[PDB]
C-alpha cells in the first residue's frame, strides 16, 4: 500500500475536504485559528492539550507540502477534533460544534481516501 505522492496532487485532493469544514458556519468558527488561551481566558488549555491543532495550521501544512501521505492529513484533522472533545465539556457549544465538523469530515474524507488508493 506504499505510494509516493506529489505535494500538489495531495493538496488538490485533500484541500476540498478542509474547505468543507471552513464552510460550516458557525461550527468552524472556533477551529479557524490556534486556540489563544490568554485571549479566550482558558488558562488551563495547554495543561490539557499538549498537541494543539487548528484549520489554519492544517492549511499551512498542505500549502508547504508537510503531508507526505494522506493519513498524515487525516491524523491532524482527528487531532483537532480529539483536542476539542478532550478540553470542552460534553454540554458545551464548542464540543457540539466539534461533533458537527467531525460528521461533515467523515462524509467528505471517505471517498477522497478511496480515490487516493
Ligand atoms: C458562534 O460560536 C462561538 C462564539 C463565541 C465563542 N466564544 C465565547 O463564548 C468566549 C470565547 C469565544 C471563543 N471560544 C473559543 C474556543 C474555546 C475553547 C476551545 O477548545 N477548543 C477550541 C477550538 C476552542 C475554542 C473560541 N472563541 C472565539 C470565537 C469562536 N470567535 C472566533 C472568531 O470569530 C468570532 C467567534 C465560542 C463560540 Cl463556539
UniProtKB/Swiss-Prot annotation:
Effect caused by changing residue 95 to C: In RSTS1; mild form; impairs binding to ASF1A and acetylated histone H3
Effect of residue 100 to E: Abolishes interaction with ASF1A
Effect listed in the UniProt record for changing residue 103 to R: Abolishes interaction with ASF1A
Substitution effect: residue 90 to E: Impairs binding to acetylated histones
Ranges for domain Bromo: 5-112
PTM entry text: Methylation of the KIX domain by CARM1 blocks association with CREB. This results in the blockade of CREB signaling, and in activation of apoptotic response.
Region (Interaction with histone): 44-90
Effect on the protein upon substituting residue 46 to A: Impairs binding to acetylated histones
Subunit composition and interactions: Found in a complex containing NCOA2; NCOA3; IKKA; IKKB and IKBKG. Probably part of a complex with HIF1A and EP300. Interacts with GATA1; the interaction results in acetylation and enhancement of transcriptional activity of GATA1. Interacts with MAF and ZCCHC12. Interacts with DAXX; the interaction is dependent on CBP sumoylation and results in suppression of the transcriptional activity via recruitment of HDAC2 to DAXX. Interacts with phosphorylated CREB1. Interacts with CITED4 (C-terminal region). Interacts (via the TAZ-type 1 domain) with HIF1A.
Disease per UniProt entry: Chromosomal aberrations involving CREBBP may be a cause of acute myeloid leukemias. Translocation t(8;16)(p11;p13) with KAT6A; translocation t(11;16)(q23;p13.3) with KMT2A/MLL1; translocation t(10;16)(q22;p13) with KAT6B. KAT6A-CREBBP may induce leukemia by inhibiting RUNX1-mediated transcription. Rubinstein-Taybi syndrome 1: A disorder characterized by craniofacial abnormalities, postnatal growth deficiency, broad thumbs, broad big toes, intellectual disability and a propensity for development of malignancies.
Role: Acetylates histones, giving a specific tag for transcriptional activation. Mediates acetylation of histone H3 at 'Lys-18' and 'Lys-27' (H3K18ac and H3K27ac, respectively). Also acetylates non-histone proteins, like DDX21, FBL, IRF2, MAFG, NCOA3, POLR1E/PAF53 and FOXO1. Binds specifically to phosphorylated CREB and enhances its transcriptional activity toward cAMP-responsive genes. Acts as a coactivator of ALX1. Acts as a circadian transcriptional coactivator which enhances the activity of the circadian transcriptional activators: NPAS2-BMAL1 and CLOCK-BMAL1 heterodimers.
Protein name: CREB-binding protein
Organism from which the protein derives: Homo sapiens
Underlying gene: CREBBP
Shown residues in whole-protein numbering: 1081 to 1197 of 2442
